[PDB]
């Protein structure tokens, strides 16, 4: 019963198997006449189906989305949008594709329709990212928040078995830290816990059958709730450290989240037992720790659990601990060198937390 200020962003979310077939209707609803479809080179097939659904509303497909939105990709995409007379951007892909859409919207003001194909949750946050001279700069601007999100679990069926797990833990991370945010509120916490519950149940169902559209729906729904928590309350240690590892050492995004989460939770656990108890309840932990339970959820379904396995040099951990301590931020427990360095060593080695 502590006071709070709740803010909800305007949102329009179209959800269900086959929903991507209504893409033209959603562009028309925005009053847009020339929508540019965005994707990575690996998702051109999906992008083409979207472009075909748009028919004469299509401004073409720009298939150069790239991880962490290099500022020169943002420029190139925006140039193409301008050249096509685009008045709308339709992002078909994961966090990186949404991110290119966000960059175009940042420079042009045009609406974005997001069609997410991972569990990253970027489609519902006002946070954008640009990588310049190797370092990712992020900011917040309502302008980058997609006007409409179309969640179609059919587009996640082919999400590979690995990323389906690791992106799912990335989403759980948003919710886990949301529960202990300095600006936590009951509504965000309600959605946080439900999001964790949905993903915790969906990971094994999807792992057993990646073509199960109900299991896929349950994960996408969880991803939406998690992303909503990310967009509404402040993150802390886990997200900051993942940014450090990803940005300073080029570690793959979802996998870094997956490996770090249990150790970031172990670090903060003593400080926020109420949030931990909610994470445990939502993950079916029983008497187990939140940390151990999330570790097992990753491990049991084939995700890597050691930074060693995703390209982190053991010899860079000392530097990683220094960078983790460089730019201060609020966290429930103080960020100190030694225990951060020990968190990093345990994450490196893939030690199951107690």
According to the annotation, is 156 in a ligand binding site?
Answer: no
Output the six-digit token pair for 218.
């349950």
Window 163-222: residues binding ligand NAD (CB under 6 A): 163, 167
262 interface partner picked from ligand NAD, Cl ion, a copy of itself, none, CB below 5 to 8 A per type: none
Site string for ligand NAD, 217-246 (x = CB under 6 A): -------------x----------------
Kind of pairing, strands 148-151 and 112-116?
A: parallel
Sign of the CA dihedral with 27 first, then 226, 170, and 122 last: positive
The nearer residue to ligand NAD, 161 or 337, going by C-beta atoms, is 161
DSSP letter, residue 17: T
Site string for a copy of itself, 195-224 (x = CB under 8 A): ------------------xx--xx--x---
List b or e across 226-243, with b for residues whose CB sees 16 or more CB atoms inside 10 angstroms: bbbbbbbbebbbbbbbbb
Contact in structure between 211 and 295 (CB atoms under 8 Å): no
2 interface partner picked from ligand NAD, Cl ion, a copy of itself, none, CB below 5 to 8 A per type: a copy of itself
As a whole number of angstroms, the distance between CA 141 and CA 125 comes to: 9
Using CB under 5 A as the binding criterion, the count of chain residues that bind Ca ion stands at 1
Window 94-133: residues binding ligand NAD (CB under 6 A): 94-97, 99, 117-118, 120-122, 125, 127, 129
Decide if residue 154 touches a copy of itself (CB under 8 A): no
Kind of pairing, strands 35-38 and 88-93?
A: parallel
The one among 156, 189, 289, 293 contacting Cl ion by CB under 5 A: 289
According to the annotation, is 135 in a ligand binding site?
Answer: no
As a whole number of angstroms, the distance between CA 168 and CA 28 comes to: 32
Smallest gap, in angstroms, from Cβ of residue 198 to a copy of itself?
9
322 interface partner picked from ligand NAD, Ca ion, Cl ion, none, CB below 5 to 8 A per type: Ca ion
As a whole number of angstroms, the distance between CA 337 and CA 122 comes to: 31
Decide if residue 7 touches a copy of itself (CB under 8 A): yes
Dihedral angle at the C-alpha atoms of 306, 311, 313, 314, nearest 10 degrees? 10
């Amino acid at each position: 019963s502590q006071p709070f200020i709740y803010e909800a962003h305007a949102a329009r979310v179209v959800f269900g198997a086959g929903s991507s077939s209504q893409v033209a209707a959603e562009v028309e609803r925005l009053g847009a006449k020339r929508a540019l479809v965005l994707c990575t080179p690996n998702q051109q097939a999906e992008a083409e189906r979207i472009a075909d659904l748009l028919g004469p509303l299509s401004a073409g497909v720009y298939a150069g989305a790239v991880m962490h939105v290099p500022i020169e990709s943002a420029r190139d995409a925006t140039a193409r949008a301008r050249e096509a007379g685009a008045d709308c951007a339709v992002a078909v892909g994961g966090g990186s594709t949404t991110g290119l859409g966000k960059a175009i919207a940042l420079e042009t003001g045009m609406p974005i329709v997001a069609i997410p194909t991972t569990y990253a949750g970027s489609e519902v946050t006002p946070v954008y990212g640009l990588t310049e001279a190797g370092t990712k700069r992020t900011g917040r601007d309502p302008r980058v928040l997609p006007r409409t999100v179309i969640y179609d679990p059919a587009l996640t069926v082919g999400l590979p078995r690995g990323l389906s797990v690791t992106s799912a833990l990335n989403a759980i991370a948003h919710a886990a830290e949301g529960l202990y945010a300095r600006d936590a509120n009951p509504v965000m916490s309600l959605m946080a816990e439900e999001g964790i519950r949905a993903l915790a149940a969906g990971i094994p169902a999807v792992f057993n059958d990646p073509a199960d559209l109900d299991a896929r729906s349950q994960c996408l729904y969880g991803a939406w709730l998690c992303g909503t928590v990310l967009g509404g309350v402040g993150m802390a240690l886990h997200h900051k450290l993942c940014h450090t590892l990803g940005g300073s050492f080029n570690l793959p995004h979802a996998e870094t989240h997956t490996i770090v989460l249990p150790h970031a939770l172990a670090y903060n656990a003593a400080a926020v037992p109420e949030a931990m108890a909610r994470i445990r309840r939502a993950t079916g932990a029983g008497e187990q720790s939140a940390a151990a339970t999330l570790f097992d959820l990753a491990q049991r379904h084939g995700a890597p659990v050691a930074l060693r396995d995703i390209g982190m040099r053991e010899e860079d951990l000392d530097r990683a601990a220094d960078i983790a301590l460089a730019s201060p931020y609020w966290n429930p427990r103080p960020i100190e060198r030694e225990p951060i360095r020990a968190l990093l060593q345990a994450a490196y080695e893939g030690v199951r937390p107690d």
